[PDB]
Ligand binder design. Structure first.
Ligand SMILES: *Nc1ccc2c(C)cc(=O)oc2c1
Ligand SMILES: *Nc1ccc2c(C)cc(=O)oc2c1
Ligand SMILES: *Nc1ccc2c(C)cc(=O)oc2c1
Ligand SMILES: *Nc1ccc2c(C)cc(=O)oc2c1
Ligand SMILES: [K+]
Ligand SMILES: [K+]
Ligand SMILES: [K+]
Ligand SMILES: [K+]
Ligand SMILES: [K+]
Ligand SMILES: [K+]
Ligand SMILES: [K+]
Ligand SMILES: [K+]
Ligand SMILES: [Zn+2]
Ligand SMILES: [Zn+2]
Ligand SMILES: [Zn+2]
Ligand SMILES: [Zn+2]
Ligand SMILES: [Zn+2]
Ligand SMILES: [Zn+2]
Lengths: 4, 364, 364, 364, 364, 4, 4, 4
């Protein structure tokens, strides 16, 4: 999952 | 007739406490007040959301957890990771109260629209579009936007949610992907590696909600003119096909030049034209904020936009105020685009606008 | 001959407290320990920098201020803005102590190199290259890199500083822009709007230091191969012309794919090749960390690089440890590049490599 | 090198109790036994999954609820709706035990593959691909497929999940949408209104898992030949790009002509060719069942497929056994396609195969 | 003048117990009551059918068997298969009582029509048109429709049975295939593999009943407009040629978009027009339900149709009631067609309407 | 027979 | 949401 | 001055  | 402005010293004070954007709420309100725009709006103190209201979207498990770790800021709880708490969403103490305050603020705004108290209600501290029912995400702990939309559903048949934040409004789109009563329209940066990773033009909603989700993937460097063309083109088609009775508009200022995320290259003026186009619909409109990591610029943008909502033209010179020192060293309201490339190839934008126009033909 | 690893439970605990990178220090050490690499290094407890040592670069005015607001975390002081404190560098309480701890840690590392205790000294919690003598900047409150270089100057004639962080190492370049005894080489993203905004290929130092500063401006999407080509080409020329006696290497992992800044598209392996090229020089080398906002990936990268320093090849499977769940859902050490464009046009890179090769001909 | 057959009189007895497919488990085993195929396989009694094993994917909240309503079959619990229980997934008493039995069965199968006890393990009562971590769905209360894949991950680096069920294997695709270590490939009917409504060719996974999910949307009436062409074409590309080390194959028989869902028009022979193509890879393969609402036909199909696994050719005449009267009107093993149109236009299939081939080029 | 509504808390409770449609009866009544439509109808408690009444169509052997296995729910009886019990029609305990209750309910409805107590009698829990005299079929254990027709025969010379269920009303057509006193008209999906497999336009009845059975085979995806055209065209001809004195109308809602069978693409409004056309005949009309596997949609449809019978227009918003959460997320009464193809080629429909018009010329 |  |  |  991508981090913001 | 006059715009409602959700404000409260205690509310702003709580928002100033959010990890990723310290003091931003105060700077925004302060600059708005410094321009004396609050005098031209009806100030309404927000109510805190009840566990029941928040539970209309968020699960009890998640809500209970948030409230628990919020007690003393337990950032070591073993279950937090499953609930999305962590780097992007730290379990800062009191966070549950802030989230409930923001959720309540947007709910209060919707209620004002419902009671015919106004046609436009503002909550610059809201717009946390990434939160899921059972999970915190992208600096968002509670999805106030969703709570607001749900509240508006009590009176309006169709709600149009428009997300102009730099990031895809995935939380909101999610909440209503199976709904045809709420249409979500999001313009955002879409590029492998860029948060949240969703929102491709092919994402149109699920089941009965198929085609009631619109996504416009955009590349770095877009500026005012091309952006408005895209926004207008899409909103024209959406309005015509969906005929909304109310609108919730998220205006994250992390698209504005000068933002540390350095992706889009917009100015508050460009976003303003989009705002104007939505306002000319004459519908109940709930205005929300969102991202914006260049604090002064975010305040500049929302202050300017508040002026647009009020049909006033603000003085170019930043008036002296509490955070006056934060707008150094120039002290003007306007923002200048950065000297970098617009990576958006015209044929692709065209391709996207058309795929969308095609998707919307199915909305009846 | 065995590498020195600057570590201390109290030290890591303090680093974990930095605003922009909570727990990162622990994750890094934890994964390194989980791979049992610490057993192959000489662990040295760092000493805290004295007011005098820090004052070898930082002004008393700034130091006094930092220490003052650090007392109880006064983030409302009227003079903080002038000293760079604010959004990027909040005045979190105890920050002075953490900064002093990091500065001390890098100084301890340099001292170890000086005492011939090793050829390679590591301080993964260091690398805060943006701090100015009288101003905090880019998450940096104290410039440990500069302090380390100054310490090495006690024994080595020429120090080569190589900054591979995503951002321009402006603070360090600044400190030595008038010196010919310290050469700074920085590879970083250079694009209008991108922090810090400096570091164009035309920036080569001032006065007697003219041509002793090297900057390699790079665009988004660069990957391992092209990046190493650039790095090797530049380092080959620099080594030949400057003939350093010691090297300080900053390895900010915010260039690695998966980083929220989503700019470069590197993998720890590519940075590893650069590391290997510098290590084959057989010089006293002070290894520093830096940026890296995807915590797990930063730990992945520096753990891998520690292995490169130790000439070991690590197991692909992330061993179980305190932060195991943070490496899901693949639970592997390798990092995969994102599927996005390399915006670096070959002719421009060529152009830049030449402009530099030309500048270096003046170094004798 | 003799196939493992997961069987137990108590197990079959529990599976016979599932609401939507009463007695199916017995009919399947019965026909297999009637052909004496069990004599050519290694029969392994399945173990029941522990709360811990099930919890490796399913949340405690959901598991607790399932177990609670399972006590006496409380189909009126107010929280069941949120957990997916209802029309498709009724809270029949003992359901938790059956779900745990099926999950355990697939886990036992994977463990056998891991222990090198065989190259092919079979659990015809498994394949409940629609269950989510915290929600029952599509007749599925627990996602045994996911549990099995997770177990295989203990020994194999890359797992290829192939779902040939009529319905999209959304639960499994979901579980691993962010993973690149597990690739999901699903062939299914995709048409507005058809459950579950997901699985368009544009769905390719999220984040690091982007392109590690493959979906082949198909229309009604497809028959053996065209279906195998599609399957082979896709599997050839997937194998080449992903190079799996183990395979989990779901073979829901609701695609077979005669099924009350009357969508696809396949025969066990067509599915058999697909099976053969996967078996020729010589990898550890976990065989699962799934849908199949024409009980006799489902037994016919899996019995035939078991023979394919055993490299035997079964007698056309259905041998006498407990359910012989259910095989009218011809009392034979072969199934004949229905006389209806194949709604799949060749150019669209071509279009889809290419998008996929394009997506797979990104897998390295 | 006022419509009779067959209802009883005990009756609804029994119907809620049918295997394939749990709780559906309650949801239907609940929504009807939530709209306060029951207040505008004459509520009549249904009487249970006697063994003699049921025996007017069903054989004693079958009735005896049903009652026997119904005792404790013997779903393992060796003779059940010959009597149609099994997957589609499980021998759930008490099933005989439920079947007798439904049969009695429809008989009570016909008796009310006979006694001139009303012109329209409703039994939404009836309509089990697939049951044969000696065999259960398609979720039907007793053919209440047939029993109702037989009852009406005591007073009316010609009965017109119109079946709008998705499936062919084979049981009813069968019962009267040799009769010219009862004409059966059925619109249904007809496609190889689709239950029950009968009902082609060429099926017109046998012996003296030749031409007194009408079948309209239709393909997937038909919508409101084309469907009504077909229905009106056929009903106009039938009325003119047969001149019925009473009408039994089956309205299975499994033709409505959203039904898991995903075949037709109708909305309650389309079926409503058909209903209106039959009601304008001013004849004694017995209204029955039938299929409908999307429970909420079935309730939506029959509630709307009840309104049509009452000449009222219902509020679009689903009023709060016991099953309110079941109508989420839109919570409205209207149903939207799915975005899929109408596979019905105009020339074929034309062809069918003519063949029928030809058959009807023989009815005098 | 057929299954419904 | 669809029913199966 | 820039924001990082
Ligand atoms: N997603 C995201 C990106 C960048 C961040 C920085 C620079 C600091 C922080 O505290 O959190 C961040 C989160
Ligand atoms: N005829 C028929 C078709 C489908 C069915 C399902 C999915 C479940 C069930 O219990 O019975 C069915 C009967
Ligand atoms: N999704 C689905 C479709 C059809 C069904 C029938 C005919 C019966 C049942 O009990 O559940 C079903 C579920
Ligand atoms: N320069 C910079 C960029 C982004 C940031 C985020 C997302 C959060 C924060 O706390 O500080 C940041 C600083
Ligand atoms: K957006
Ligand atoms: K929607
Ligand atoms: K750098
Ligand atoms: K220099
Ligand atoms: K499938
Ligand atoms: K995947
Ligand atoms: K029909
Ligand atoms: K007849
Ligand atoms: Zn944003
Ligand atoms: Zn950096
Ligand atoms: Zn790629
Ligand atoms: Zn299926
Ligand atoms: Zn039906
Ligand atoms: Zn459509």
């Amino acid at each position: 999952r991508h981090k913001k | 007739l006059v715009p409602v402005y959700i404000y409260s010293p205690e509310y702003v004070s709580m928002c100033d406490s959010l990890a990723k954007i310290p003091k931003r709420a105060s700077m925004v309100h302060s600059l708005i007040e410094a321009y004396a725009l609050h005098k031209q709006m009806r100030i309404v103190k927000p109510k805190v959301a009840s566990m029941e209201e928040m539970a209309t979207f968020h699960t009890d498990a998640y809500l209970q957890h948030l409230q628990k770790v919020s007690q003393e800021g337990d950032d070591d709880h073993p279950d937090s990771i499953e609930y999305g708490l962590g780097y992007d969403c730290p379990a800062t103490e009191g966070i549950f109260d802030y989230a409930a305050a923001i959720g309540g603020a947007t709910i209060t705004a919707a209620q004002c629209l419902i009671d015919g108290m106004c046609k436009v209600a503002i909550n610059w501290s809201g717009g946390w579009h990434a939160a899921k029912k059972d999970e915190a995400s992208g600096f968002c702990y509670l999805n106030d936007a969703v709570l607001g939309i749900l509240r508006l559903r009590r009176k309006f048949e169709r709600i149009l949610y428009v997300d102009l934040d730099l990031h895809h409004g995935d939380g909101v789109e999610d909440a209503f992907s199976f709904t045809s009563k709420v249409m979500t329209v999001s313009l955002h940066k879409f590029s492998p590696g860029f948060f949240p990773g969703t929102g491709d033009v092919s994402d149109v909603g699920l089941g009965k909600g198929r085609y009631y989700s619109v996504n416009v993937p955009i590349q770095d460097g877009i500026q005012d003119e091309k952006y408005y063309q895209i926004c207008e083109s899409v909103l024209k088609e959406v309005y015509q096909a969906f005929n909304p009775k109310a609108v919730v508009l998220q205006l994250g200022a992390d698209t504005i030049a000068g933002d540390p995320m350095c992706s889009f290259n917009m100015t508050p003026v460009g976003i303003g034209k989009c705002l104007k186009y939505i306002l000319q619909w004459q519908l109940a409109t709930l205005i929300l904020g969102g991202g914006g990591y260049n604090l002064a610029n975010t305040a500049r943008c929302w202050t300017y936009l508040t002026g647009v909502i009020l049909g006033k033209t603000l003085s170019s010179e930043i008036p002296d105020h509490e955070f006056f020192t934060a707008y150094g060293p120039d002290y003007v309201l306007e923002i200048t685009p950065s000297c970098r490339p617009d990576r958006n190839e015209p044929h692709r934008i065209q391709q996207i606008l058309n795929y969308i126009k095609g998707n919307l033909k199915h909305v009846v």
